[PDB]
Amino acid sequence: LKVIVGALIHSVKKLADVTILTIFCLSVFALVGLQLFKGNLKNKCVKNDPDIYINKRGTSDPLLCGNGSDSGHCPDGYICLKTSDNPDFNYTSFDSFAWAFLSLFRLMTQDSWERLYQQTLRTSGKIYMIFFVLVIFLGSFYLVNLILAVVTMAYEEQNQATWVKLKTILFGLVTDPFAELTITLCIVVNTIFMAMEHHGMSPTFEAMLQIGNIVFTIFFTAEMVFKIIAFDPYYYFQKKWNIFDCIIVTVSLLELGVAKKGSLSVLRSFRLLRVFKLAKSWPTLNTLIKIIGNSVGALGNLTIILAIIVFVFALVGKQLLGENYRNNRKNISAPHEDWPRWHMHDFFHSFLIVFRILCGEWIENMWACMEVGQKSICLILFLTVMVLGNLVVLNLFIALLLNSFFADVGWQVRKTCYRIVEHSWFESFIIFMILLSSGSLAFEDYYLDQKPTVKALLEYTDRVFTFIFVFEMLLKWVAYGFKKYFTNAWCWLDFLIVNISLISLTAKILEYSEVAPIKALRTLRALRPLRALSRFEGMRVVVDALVGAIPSIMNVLLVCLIFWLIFSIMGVNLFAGKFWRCINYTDGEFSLVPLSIVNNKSDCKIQNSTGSFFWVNVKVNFDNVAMGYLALLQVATFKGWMDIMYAAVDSREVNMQPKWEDNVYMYLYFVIFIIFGGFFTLNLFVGVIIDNFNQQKKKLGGQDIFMTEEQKKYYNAMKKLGSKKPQKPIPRPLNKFQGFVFDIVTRQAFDITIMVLICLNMITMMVETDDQSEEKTKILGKINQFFVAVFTGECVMKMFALRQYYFTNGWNVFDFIVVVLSIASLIFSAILKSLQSYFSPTLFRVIRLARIGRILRLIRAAKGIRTLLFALMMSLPALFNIGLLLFLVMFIYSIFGMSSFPHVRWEAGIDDMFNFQTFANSMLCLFQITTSAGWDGLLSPILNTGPPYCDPNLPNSNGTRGDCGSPAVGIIFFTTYIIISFLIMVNMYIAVILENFN
Numbered sequence: 001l002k003v004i005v006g007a008l009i010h011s012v013k014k015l016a017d018v019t020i021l022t023i024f025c026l027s028v029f030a031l032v033g034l035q036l037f038k039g040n041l042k043n044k045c046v047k048n049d050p051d052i053y054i055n056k057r058g059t060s061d062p063l064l065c066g067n068g069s070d071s072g073h074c075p076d077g078y079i080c081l082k083t084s085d086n087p088d089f090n091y092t093s094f095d096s097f098a099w100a101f102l103s104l105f106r107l108m109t110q111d112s113w114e115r116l117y118q119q120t121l122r123t124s125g126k127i128y129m130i131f132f133v134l135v136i137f138l139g140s141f142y143l144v145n146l147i148l149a150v151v152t153m154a155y156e157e158q159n160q161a162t163w164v165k166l167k168t169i170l171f172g173l174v175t176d177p178f179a180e181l182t183i184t185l186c187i188v189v190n191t192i193f194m195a196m197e198h199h200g201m202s203p204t205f206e207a208m209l210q211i212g213n214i215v216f217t218i219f220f221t222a223e224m225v226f227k228i229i230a231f232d233p234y235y236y237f238q239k240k241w242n243i244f245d246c247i248i249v250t251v252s253l254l255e256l257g258v259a260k261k262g263s264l265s266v267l268r269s270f271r272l273l274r275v276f277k278l279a280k281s282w283p284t285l286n287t288l289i290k291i292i293g294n295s296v297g298a299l300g301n302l303t304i305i306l307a308i309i310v311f312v313f314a315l316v317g318k319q320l321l322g323e324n325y326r327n328n329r330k331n332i333s334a335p336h337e338d339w340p341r342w343h344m345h346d347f348f349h350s351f352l353i354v355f356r357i358l359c360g361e362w363i364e365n366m367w368a369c370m371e372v373g374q375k376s377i378c379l380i381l382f383l384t385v386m387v388l389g390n391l392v393v394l395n396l397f398i399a400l401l402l403n404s405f406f407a408d409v410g411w412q413v414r415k416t417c418y419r420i421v422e423h424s425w426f427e428s429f430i431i432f433m434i435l436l437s438s439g440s441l442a443f444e445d446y447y448l449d450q451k452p453t454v455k456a457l458l459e460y461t462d463r464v465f466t467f468i469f470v471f472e473m474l475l476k477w478v479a480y481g482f483k484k485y486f487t488n489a490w491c492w493l494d495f496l497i498v499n500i501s502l503i504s505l506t507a508k509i510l511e512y513s514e515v516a517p518i519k520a521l522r523t524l525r526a527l528r529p530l531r532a533l534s535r536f537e538g539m540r541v542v543v544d545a546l547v548g549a550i551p552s553i554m555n556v557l558l559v560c561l562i563f564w565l566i567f568s569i570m571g572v573n574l575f576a577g578k579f580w581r582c583i584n585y586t587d588g589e590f591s592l593v594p595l596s597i598v599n600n601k602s603d604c605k606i607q608n609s610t611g612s613f614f615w616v617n618v619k620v621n622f623d624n625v626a627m628g629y630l631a632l633l634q635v636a637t638f639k640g641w642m643d644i645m646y647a648a649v650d651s652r653e654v655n656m657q658p659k660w661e662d663n664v665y666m667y668l669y670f671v672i673f674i675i676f677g678g679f680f681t682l683n684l685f686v687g688v689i690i691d692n693f694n695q696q697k698k699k700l701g702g703q704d705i706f707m708t709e710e711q712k713k714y715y716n717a718m719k720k721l722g723s724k725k726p727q728k729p730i731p732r733p734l735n736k737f738q739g740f741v742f743d744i745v746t747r748q749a750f751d752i753t754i755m756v757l758i759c760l761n762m763i764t765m766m767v768e769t770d771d772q773s774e775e776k777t778k779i780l781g782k783i784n785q786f787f788v789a790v791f792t793g794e795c796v797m798k799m800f801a802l803r804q805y806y807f808t809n810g811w812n813v814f815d816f817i818v819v820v821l822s823i824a825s826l827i828f829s830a831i832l833k834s835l836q837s838y839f840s841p842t843l844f845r846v847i848r849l850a851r852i853g854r855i856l857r858l859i860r861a862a863k864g865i866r867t868l869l870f871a872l873m874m875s876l877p878a879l880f881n882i883g884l885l886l887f888l889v890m891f892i893y894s895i896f897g898m899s900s901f902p903h904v905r906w907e908a909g910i911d912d913m914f915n916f917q918t919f920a921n922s923m924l925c926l927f928q929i930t931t932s933a934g935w936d937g938l939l940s941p942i943l944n945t946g947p948p949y950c951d952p953n954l955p956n957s958n959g960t961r962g963d964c965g966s967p968a969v970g971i972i973f974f975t976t977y978i979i980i981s982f983l984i985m986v987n988m989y990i991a992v993i994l995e996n997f998n
């Protein structure tokens with residue numbers, strides 16, 4: 001333990017400069033957030049003829065609002081008034097720099113950021129989504145890729161530093177190449193009947209599955225008695241894997257024997273472990289077993305440390321935290337319950353909280369433990385748990401990944417067309433038509449029916465567009481030929497899209513438009529943007545990179561599908577059909593009915609006299625192996641996993657109302673899943689990704705990917721920038737006075753005085769606060785005037801001494817820009833202030849933001865900040881290319897959503913600001929979930945299929961006949977997207993991580 005703990009201390013040492021840089025960026029973004037939004041999360045709709053609010057529909061939070069136009073609107077009779085309290089428990093806000101650093105830490109680790117993004121966009125305005133795009137790319141994505149890329153070197157640095165029976169045996173040993181095949185076929189086929197049980201079986205299907213189970217039991221037991229009466233029972237217990245198969249057969253025998261219907265459904269699912277036998281002929285699953293075994297083997301010390309840390313922090317939490325969680329629980333419990341769901345009143349629950357912090361969900365509890373106990377203890381406990389857990393897990397994952405993996409006239413017309421198709425203006429003209437045709441889809445949104453003219457313009461536009469693209473096709477055919485055209489392999493995209501469009505337009509010619517299949521070809525018209533992939537060279541090179549790696553993804557996806565099949569079958573054994581419940585539903589809000597009225601489905605059928613009561617099911621349940629795959633993806637991505645676990649542990653037998661934590665220990669099912677599925681399948685996936693990328697790069701003679709040919713030239717320039725050590729010593733001035741300023745500014749003392757004065761300006765910035773006072777505002781403005789004068793004095797003194805040498809350097813140009821911006825901003829405020837036309841206050845907050853450049857002046861002497869920022873700049877080209885491809889994907893998916901899901905009812909994730917009725921709103925939701933954040937929130941109103949959730953007989957909204965989504969289409973829009981973004985982003989990581997190494 002000591003040898004490895006010393007290495008962990010070294011890994012903490014290596015975080016030296018990254019901690020500095022993270023603190024600096026977190027602070028700058030804290031000041032930006034504090035400036036722009038201070039006191040905005042306080043705007044809440046309050047009625048008017050104390051305070052009278054109205055809750056947000058389907059929740060109990062007070063409604064957040066705005067007086068702006070794209071900010072968020074109150075219902076009738078509700079004026080957006082700024083009030084005293086903050087949203088959550090008064091802890092999430094931007095009102096002062098300390099809360100601002102809290103919120104920007106929440107954004108760096110991406111814990112429940114989707115909710116803060118919702119709130120600040122709802123309060124200040126959609127346009128401020130530019131802040132989160134910019135603090136999630138720099139905070140979350142980038143500042144994690146510094147941690148992952150410095151731990152790795154610390155761990156590489158560590159490692160690199162160091163008679164009649166014998167006649168029965170005569171056909172006992174007849175195990176030829178055809179018997180083994182029988183065993184494999186039996187394994188697979190038995191798994192296929194285990195993967196075929198569901199909830200509502202009629203008895204006959206259950207009986208068939210039973211007979212099949214018994215047959216496969218006796219088959220494998222027969223195999224075992226054969227083997228024991230084939231070798232000698234001495235050496236039979238010497239092989240590694242025969243012991244495993246024999247323990248499985250004993251457990252199967254016992255489960256058959258002891259007879260209860262569903263008896264300990266873990267014992268009925270224990271057979272599934274047999275698939276691991278199919279690893280002799282499946283080398284990738286052999287490597288998965290190699291990884292797990294090493295995790296508990298040659299790397300046992302690291303997992304021992306991790307277990308020690310989790311046990312210690314669960315204990316400390318229980319002892320310090322626990323008593324007050326008991327009696328203060330009315331202060332953190334849900335509206336109609338009696339205990340909080342997540343608390344620290346016993347070792348299991350304390351461990352569950354420490355685990356959920358290890359997953360990454362570390363704030364939402366902190367608010368509660370601060371509302372129940374002391375605040376300093378909560379902050380220290382949770383934040384030390386977080387840093388230490390997400391450091392030991394990170395180091396263990398790196399170690400498993402690193403060592404364990406890395407062990408005549410016709411000829412003339414053809415020729416005419418042919419010279420023309422290559423001519424540069426021709427290509428650019430076609431690209432232009434693609435850009436307009438793609439962009440014209442964004443105008444086809446919900447409201448287009450009430451715009452009687454824009455529609456017709458778009459229709460004529462589409463007709464001219466099908467013409468123009470068909471003409472390009474025929475030009476390219478009689479240019480190239482039928483034989484070369486198709487072989488190129490980018491032309492098939494164009495031909496398919498053109499055929500789809502020429503089915504659609506013809507269907508608008510005839511009366512067969514509303515025949516459902518052609519109306520399902522039409523919806524495909526959202527792939528028109530995809531014609532852009534070929535024309536842009538950067539998207540082309542990135543697509544080549546991804547298509548080069550689709551094979552390896554396919555192997556690992558097969559292994560992941562088998563392995564999650566195991567857990568989905570366990571889930572169907574354990575939970576299937578028990579997620580149902582009753583709910584008294586009145587208006588938009590649903591509460592489980594107390595167990596003193598129901599306990600049964602045959603009690604909702606009786607107490608339904610009012611009609612509020614309805615018998616329902618959770619949207620993402622475990623009733624099938626199919627729905628089990630979705631519930632496993634939601635657990636493995638940690639989104640919507642909580643509504644799952646609550647009804648897993650509430651569960652009882654079938655047709656019975658669920659009880660408050662009547663299955664407390666089913667959380668072990670989800671813990672075990674996350675550990676094995678998430679941690680180890682992900683480790684396997686990333687291992688094959690790195691190996692693939694390494695060999696892929698090495699093939700090309702060790703050049704770069706995601707980068708074009710000209711990007712390599714820009715790279716040569718940037719690389720030659722950050723190396724040039726000598727610069728001409730500047731000449732000394734002649735004039736006596738122009739010599740003296742030269743003498744004074746050029747020493748080190750002036751630089752250090754200005755450095756510390758920037759720091760004192762920062763301190764003057766951090767005191768700024770919502771609703772402070774009048775006097776403090778005035779005094780801070782006077783002090784601000786003192787700095788803008790001194791920094792002007794600094795620049796003018798530089799100019800007088802260094803006339804042109806100044807304008808040679810770059811940092812001199814930067815602080816020149818910020819000096820002129822600060823003076824201009826003060827002049828702009830002076831004029832546009834109450835002296836002149838009083839526009840919106842919010843303009844003043846944006847104006848006051850020219851000061852933060854003063855802060856960013858600070859990185860001239862800072863080695864660490866400057867070097868890691870130069871690494872970011874070197875990466876930015878490839879980041880641009882993959883950003884282009886991710887943009888195209890977000891764009892296509894935007895139109896798909898905007899055409900398929902606008903009429904869905906407003907519910908959990910879809911409200912009057914984040915929905916799919918417009919290109920702004922749809923792009924908002926798609927960006928929220930590019931990071932997979934909150935995607936279960938949007939998907940939930942899709943799966944609606946009737947009362948109480950949707951009204952399928954609505955007179956208006958001629959869509960799915962009412963406010964209902966398409967469950968088949970949600971699960972494939974939302975699931976594939978987060979997989980495509982996942983694989984797109986993964987290639988964004990490989991860019992920067994391979995930039996830090998250099």
Ligand SMILES: CCCCCCCCCCCCCCCCCCOC[C@@H](O)COP(=O)(O)OCC[N+](C)(C)C
Binds near residue numbers: 184202204205208
């Ligand atoms: C290298 C080795 C690995 C390669 C894999 C190759 C192995 C091949 C495996 C083949 C798998 C084939 C599995 C066979 C399963 C067929 C699937 C069997 O179907 C049975 C049901 O369709 C019948 O349903 P019931 O008879 O219960 O009636 C339903 C109840 N009602 C509706 C009537 C009331």
Ligand SMILES: CCCCCCCCCCCCCCCCCCOC[C@@H](O)COP(=O)(O)OCC[N+](C)(C)C
Binds near residue numbers: 488489493
């Ligand atoms: C009901 C159906 C609904 C379908 C909805 C989903 C639609 C998704 C469509 C995705 C299309 C993806 C297209 C990807 C095309 C990649 C195609 C990548 O191939 C590139 C080569 O063709 C380039 O040609 P060169 O001549 O430069 O060199 C040849 C290089 N090789 C080929 C010899 C190695």
Ligand SMILES: *[C@@H]1O[C@H](CO)[C@@H](O[C@@H]2O[C@H](CO)[C@@H](O)[C@H](O)[C@H]2NC(C)=O)[C@H](O)[C@H]1NC(C)=O
Binds near residue numbers: 605612
């Ligand atoms: C309780 O009664 C209400 C109304 O009497 C039932 O609501 C009906 O639900 C069915 C399908 O479940 C719909 O076809 C009807 O249109 C609904 N009727 C009304 C008036 O809303 C509800 O199903 C009953 N709940 C249970 C399970 O007993």
Ligand SMILES: CC(C)CCC[C@@H](C)[C@H]1CC[C@H]2[C@@H]3CC=C4C[C@@H](O)CC[C@]4(C)[C@H]3CC[C@]12C
Binds near residue numbers: 240243244247273
């Ligand atoms: C209860 C189930 C689901 C958990 C997973 C089953 C695993 C852990 C069990 C089943 C069979 C067991 C293995 C069978 C025999 C051996 C060979 C011995 O030299 C080392 C231990 C080892 C390798 C056992 C370790 C534990 C084991 C692998």
Ligand SMILES: CC(C)CCC[C@@H](C)[C@H]1CC[C@H]2[C@@H]3CC=C4C[C@@H](O)CC[C@]4(C)[C@H]3CC[C@]12C
Binds near residue numbers: 281
């Ligand atoms: C439904 C589940 C339980 C059964 C899985 C069926 C498929 C995916 C499994 C069963 C047998 C497996 C194959 C067994 C043997 C080989 C040979 C190896 O060189 C490549 C992998 C390959 C080709 C495996 C791929 C995955 C595989 C085909």
Ligand SMILES: CC(C)CCC[C@@H](C)[C@H]1CC[C@H]2[C@@H]3CC=C4C[C@@H](O)CC[C@]4(C)[C@H]3CC[C@]12C
Binds near residue numbers: 486487488490492493
């Ligand atoms: C199932 C439906 C919807 C899609 C089928 C479209 C197929 C037939 C189209 C789309 C892309 C086309 C392929 C693109 C790449 C090449 C180049 C070379 O390898 C031979 C032809 C081949 C392989 C094309 C054959 C036809 C092709 C495969």
Ligand SMILES: CC(C)CCC[C@@H](C)[C@H]1CC[C@H]2[C@@H]3CC=C4C[C@@H](O)CC[C@]4(C)[C@H]3CC[C@]12C
Binds near residue numbers: 097762763767768769
């Ligand atoms: C060098 C000394 C003076 C301060 C060093 C840390 C400074 C820069 C920062 C860190 C945290 C900041 C504090 C965060 C929030 C508040 C609460 C507000 O009601 C008064 C200002 C005050 C108290 C800030 C003062 C400046 C501050 C203390």
Ligand SMILES: *[C@@H]1O[C@H](CO)[C@@H](O)[C@H](O)[C@H]1NC(C)=O
Binds near residue numbers: 043
């Ligand atoms: C919103 O505008 C109303 C007047 O219409 C005003 O009374 C209210 O205070 C405003 N709130 C804010 C924060 O702008």
Ligand SMILES: *[C@@H]1O[C@H](CO)[C@@H](O)[C@H](O)[C@H]1NC(C)=O
Binds near residue numbers: 330331
């Ligand atoms: C919870 O908060 C209320 C005040 O809102 C308090 O009266 C009650 O006693 C608290 N919890 C306990 C200890 O039951």
Ligand SMILES: *[C@@H]1O[C@H](CO)[C@@H](O)[C@H](O)[C@H]1NC(C)=O
Binds near residue numbers: 584585586593594597
């Ligand atoms: C259901 O909710 C309504 C209030 O909206 C209430 O009046 C009714 O008594 C409740 N019934 C039960 C027992 O759930």
Ligand SMILES: *[C@@H]1O[C@H](CO)[C@@H](O)[C@H](O)[C@H]1NC(C)=O
Binds near residue numbers: 598602603
């Ligand atoms: C339903 O619950 C009641 C107790 O409230 C019980 O007496 C009755 O037999 C139960 N019936 C069913 C449907 O099991």
